[PDB]
């Protein structure tokens, strides 16, 4: 499709699964895999793996090379240290 896709593998928490998709459009890459996991905003929050603190679908946290975001929907935030 495009001619400059970025390598960004995705991840999940509830179910042990990982969707790898290299899309050039940031919000797009997430909007796809993210929507596949069926997770709402307030109900479910998307964050990174190492820190998992906060991740806005707008852009990545200065991590263009790879974006291993682990879907997280709980009263607590993810803290994989």
């Amino acid at each position: 499709m495009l001619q400059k896709p970025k390598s960004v593998k995705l991840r999940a928490l509830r179910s042990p699964r990982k969707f790898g998709v290299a899309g050039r459009s940031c919000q797009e890459v997430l909007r796809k895999g993210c929507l596949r996991f069926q997770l709402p905003e307030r109900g479910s929050r998307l964050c990174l793996y190492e820190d998992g603190t906060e991740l806005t679908e707008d852009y990545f946290p200065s991590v263009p090379d790879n974006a291993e975001l682990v879907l997280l929907t709980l009263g607590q935030a993810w803290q994989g240290h």
Partner: protein, 89 residues
């Protein structure tokens, strides 16, 4: 305008056969269909997913399926979910 423009001959595999297979598809949806008739399998009635022999992650988008070079190895899990999962201790 007869042949395809962005065509990438990748290699697919079967869950029952341990040998490597080869197919020619430009998009994931095409890789499966073309990988179903070329693979010559009888359990085509099973939803075969796609994973990476290296990362083992499923790509629901042609993104990575096309971001890779022409020569690439892939794996499809047939009715038998027996997939290869790697665990880093």
């Amino acid at each position: 305008s007869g042949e395809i423009r962005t065509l990438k001959p990748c290699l697919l595999r079967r869950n029952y056969s341990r040998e490597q297979h080869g197919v020619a598809a430009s998009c994931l949806e095409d890789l499966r269909s073309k990988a179903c008739d070329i693979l010559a399998i009888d359990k085509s009635l099973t939803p075969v997913t796609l994973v990476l022999a290296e990362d083992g992650t499923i790509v629901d988008d042609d993104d990575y399926f096309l971001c890779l070079p022409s020569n690439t190895k892939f794996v499809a899990l047939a009715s038998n979910e027996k997939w290869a999962y790697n665990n880093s201790d």
